[PDB]
Amino acid sequence: LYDRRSIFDAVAQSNCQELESLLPFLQRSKKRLTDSEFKDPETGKTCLLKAMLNLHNGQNDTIALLLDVARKTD
């Protein structure tokens, strides 16, 4: 299972293994990664913007993971 806080912490730490089950989670739940559950309630930022603001040596492997998940889901 996943929620906004878990995804945000995973992309902040750049742990791709925590996000391995994100695609089947979304496909079983039948809800989009762009839905309001995953945006911040106040700023409106999404997990991609959280990932982009946390780069280590100019790298963050979770960005491609999120883009592929967004491609595959809806």
Curated annotation (Swiss-Prot):
Note: Responses evoked by capsaicin, but not by low pH and heat, can be antagonized by capsazepine.
Ranges in coiled-coil conformation: none
Similarity remark: Belongs to the transient receptor (TC 1.A.4) family. TrpV subfamily. TRPV1 sub-subfamily.
Whole sequence portion shown: 111 to 184 of 838
Sequence ranges of the ANK repeats: 1-28, 43-74
Tissue note: Predominantly expressed in trigeminal and dorsal root sensory ganglia. Expressed also in hippocampus, cortex, cerebellum, olfactory bulb, mesencephalon and hindbrain. High expression in the cell bodies and dendrites of neurons in the hippocampus and in the cortex. In the brain detected also in astrocytes and pericytes (at protein level). Isoform 1 and isoform 3 are expressed in brain and peripheral blood mononuclear cells.
Subcellular location: Postsynaptic cell membrane; Cell projection, Dendritic spine membrane; Cell membrane
Subunit structure: Homotetramer. Interacts with PIRT. May also form a heteromeric channel with TRPV3. Interacts with CALM, PRKCM and CSK. Interacts with PRKCG and NTRK1, probably by forming a trimeric complex. Interacts with the Scolopendra mutilans RhTx toxin. Interacts with the spider Tau-theraphotoxin-Hs1a. Interacts with TMEM100. Interacts with PACS2.
Cited function: Non-selective calcium permeant cation channel involved in detection of noxious chemical and thermal stimuli. Seems to mediate proton influx and may be involved in intracellular acidosis in nociceptive neurons. Involved in mediation of inflammatory pain and hyperalgesia. Sensitized by a phosphatidylinositol second messenger system activated by receptor tyrosine kinases, which involves PKC isozymes and PCL. Activation by vanilloids, like capsaicin, and temperatures higher than 42 degrees Celsius.
Residues bearing PTM Phosphothreonine: 34
Effect on the protein of changing residue 5 to D: Abolishes capsaicin-evoked current and binding to resiniferatoxin
Post-translational modification: Phosphorylation by PKA reverses capsaicin-induced dephosphorylation at multiple sites, probably including Ser-6 as a major phosphorylation site. Phosphorylation by CAMKII seems to regulate binding to vanilloids. Phosphorylated and modulated by PRKCE, PRKCM and probably PRKCZ. Dephosphorylation by calcineurin seems to lead to receptor desensitization and phosphorylation by CAMKII recovers activity.
Domains as described in the record: The association domain (AD) is necessary for self-association.
Binding-site residues for ATP, renumbered to this chain: 5, 45, 50, 54
Biological source species: Rattus norvegicus (Rat)
Phosphoserine: modified positions: 6
Signal peptide: none
Name of the protein: Transient receptor potential cation channel subfamily V member 1
